[PDB]
Design a protein around this nucleic acid. Structure first.
Lengths: 198, 121, 217, 216, 121
RNA sequence: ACGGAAACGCUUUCUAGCUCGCUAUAAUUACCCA
């Protein structure tokens, strides 16, 4: 067993967003209590085509009124008196910051989640994080990366770390040897939706 | 209606019948539609094509009913998409689904729009 | 004599696996590394070919005195369990690896699962110009579990090598748990557990009392 | 006396069948190991030759008193049921295997199934160098069923050997259910299941109701 | 157009009339076209060449339709696949396929392009 | 009173053995607009 293993504990000083490419729009959340409620919008439109409100919802969605308070789908619920909010999805409680005409955040990016809806950190993310550290602190991998100059200095060489099967040679592949696993999934009480600040 | 023998030509004719920069003739014929916004449109259908493959239409009818609303909301925000949901008959041909192989054909129509949009521009 | 005994196990995934797959007619945005699935239930499969293939090459770091460079250069403990082509006596060797099928698909509806696979975005970042390169690769979900049959022939040529081979079988199964069974693997994607290691005779007469004490121990 | 009785059963499968046909030099990106397919319907066959050869070689491990170099050196229990080219008593030996012809194209189309054969994509990894070399091999899909039928003839006095021939034949069908029929084999590709094992007498007079219970 | 005559002799003639790296004089005279971008189109035509031997032609109409999408989309991404589908008249040969004997002629034509792509460099 | 009559080109025989769909790869970057 040459498989020497390591256990990495990762503490979060700053908030970390990872993943998924999906984003809720500005009309796909509910801010009733101190809890942004992200519902399954298919069931939300199922429940509300039964209340004759699907045409009223289609009118709401292209309705750019001022005071963004009135454009964030709490106004559609409290306007037409919808009190049954029993949809699949999840709540994440408010920070208390990012305010007042509060609740008028616009587009959140969903954190990476597995099929159970429990979020986790994938090991491909943390392996790429490790890979920039290991590339930067090496005076063999810094030097001649930015190459070929043809299109517009277009790309890394990707071969300063020797990768591949490489016919004839033995199989080295350093970063096949480092094997980062994913995380056991944490609970989505741990998510807060910070904004961004340049 | 889009059928399995015409939708790619419909998609080409829809991407051509689509407005361009009248002014700013430095690299002209550039659309008033960007690649990110059209890939935003295709993102709505990419997570229904896989389940058109996998599972039954009677669990996807609800998600198509919300897909109508997703295209409505994207049409309302930017006027660039608003002159694409009318040129390409997207809201017309979205009501025309009723089974699996027209859901799949609609997702392929969206991919044909993205393909001809990359090909022209 | 002749007997066939059957190693059952239940494969539990962890960070579930991606045994790469079929379709060329996929999409422009959707899953572009598909996983291998049943053609009829569309549930994910662990094929027995990948199980045997990882198991040989993980047992071959351990059981080859001289280095391999090919199968049919393995060391007559793996030639008899996995076949050579170029030994006269070790061609059909003694182990049948069936394809694992998804077993707990009803259990994975009591947990909130929309679909028995997941799609995972993965993004090659370029290190100069910082440009991104996304991909959506499919993998079976984490608590998926699989039936695992593995059938063993005991003829008279298995004179006293049955126990010595079952050492190797339960060494290879615990060695797959230290490695990943197909897919990215260095990025997650692999970790397999084997529970309920149970060997029963399906043909002939052989004692499975002493067999299930280097399995479960 | 003379009789011909028929063992009909249904070869369901699991980890579906590769049973190769032409290994002719295929196309550049296409299937490398095409499965054996019917000329008209283009559906798979489980032919009689594969069933007969598998069931000899699996019953040769069981019913031989002594290990045979060849089918000529098989025991008389198998030489009478599968024929022997060299024994005068056992030329044309008592069983007729027939090709099996995909009972349920309509049931599979009732399920969500496009093709009756899948192409599974597969590779070998070199041991030094870890090169990969792929494979596209065809595979008659999982829950297909196939019409299996045997014919057993009952001649002059084979009548004392009837019952303890069927104990053999049943046993052979119990060994195909533990082994694999066809290609690639020890990598999946094999599992069959004989269902609705019914023995009907077709020509002549034999009492199969004292026998159809043996096959449940 | 390509008939059951010179359709392979077209494909070889398309590969020699395809642009190269006049630059990069370290194993020079190599294409801009990378062979993975071309095997991702042979993968499509290979599955169709296999299914045409079994299924009908009416049961391949959607599948064949999607071919044009990919040959458009892959052309809009790289300029190398763009002059692949321009030097080899692939979008024109795609419009010509109407029978299974013409589908298979296109599907073997793409194999000839891949065969001569590997044969030269 | 047909160079003819009588005569199964037939029996036996698994397209099979070996082979990981695998290698590298942070869903990321820029910061604004009316």
């Amino acid at each position: 067993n040459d498989y020497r293993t390591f256990k990495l504990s990762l503490l979060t000083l700053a908030p970390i967003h990872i993943g998924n490419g999906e984003k809720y729009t500005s009309r796909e959340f509910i801010y009733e209590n101190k809890k942004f409620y992200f519902p399954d919008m298919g069931k939300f439109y199922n429940k509300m085509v039964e209340k004759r409100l699907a045409e009223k919802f289609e009118a709401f969605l292209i309705q750019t009124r001022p005071n963004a308070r009135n454009n964030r789908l709490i106004s559609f619920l409290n306007d037409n008196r919808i009190a049954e909010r029993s949809f699949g999805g999840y709540s994440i409680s408010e920070t208390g910051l990012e305010s007042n005409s509060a609740g008028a955040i616009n587009e959140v990016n969903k954190f990476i989640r597995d099929a159970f809806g429990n979020p986790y950190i994938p090991g491909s993310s943390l392996k790429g994080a490790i890979r920039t550290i290991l590339m930067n602190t090496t005076p063999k991998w810094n030097n001649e990366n930015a190459v070929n100059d043809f299109g517009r200095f277009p790309k890394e060489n990707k071969n300063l770390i020797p990768w591949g099967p490489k016919k004839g040679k033995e199989y080295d592949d350093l970063f096949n040897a480092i094997r980062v696993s994913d995380s056991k999934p944490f609970d989505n009480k741990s998510l807060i939706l910070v904004q961004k600040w340049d | 209606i889009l059928t399995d023998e015409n939708y790619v030509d419909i998609a080409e004719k829809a991407i051509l019948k689509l407005e361009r920069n009248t002014r700013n003739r430095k690299n002209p014929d550039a659309f008033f539609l960007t690649t990110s916004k059209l890939r935003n449109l295709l993102s709505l259908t990419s997570t229904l094509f896989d389940e058109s493959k996998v599972k039954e239409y009677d669990a996807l009818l609800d998600r198509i009913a919300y897909l109508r609303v997703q295209f409505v909301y994207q049409a309302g925000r930017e006027i660039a998409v608003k002159d694409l949901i009318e040129k390409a008959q997207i809201l017309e041909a979205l009501k025309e689904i009723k089974d699996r192989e027209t859901l799949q054909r609609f997702c392929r129509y969206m991919e044909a729009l993205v393909a001809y949009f990359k090909f022209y521009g | 004599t002749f007997a066939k005994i059957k190693f059952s196990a239940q494969i539990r995934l962890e960070t579930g696996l991606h045994i790469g797959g079929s379709d060329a007619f996929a999409a422009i945005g959707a899953i572009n590394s598909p996983v291998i699935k049943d053609p009829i239930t569309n549930l994910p499969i662990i094929p027995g070919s990948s199980l045997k293939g990882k198991m040989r090459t993980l047992l071959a770091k351990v059981y080859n005195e001289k280095v391999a460079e090919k199968p049919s250069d393995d060391s007559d403990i793996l030639s008899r369990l996995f076949g050579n082509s170029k030994d006269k006596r070790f061609k059909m060797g003694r182990l049948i690896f069936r394809d694992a099928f998804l077993s707990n698909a009803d259990e994975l509806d009591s947990l909130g699962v929309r679909s028995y696979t997941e799609v995972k975005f993965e993004n090659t970042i370029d290190r100069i110009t910082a440009e991104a390169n996304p991909r959506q690769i499919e993998r079976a979900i984490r608590n998926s579990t699989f039936d695992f049959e593995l059938i063993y022939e005991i003829t008279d040529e298995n004179e006293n090598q049955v126990e010595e081979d079952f050492k190797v079988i339960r060494d290879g199964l615990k060695l797959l748990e230290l490695d990943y069974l197909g897919g990215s693997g260095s990025r997650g994607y692999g970790k397999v557990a084997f529970e309920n290691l149970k060997a029963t005779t399906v043909f002939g007469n052989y004692d499975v009392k002493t067999l299930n004490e280097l399995l479960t121990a």
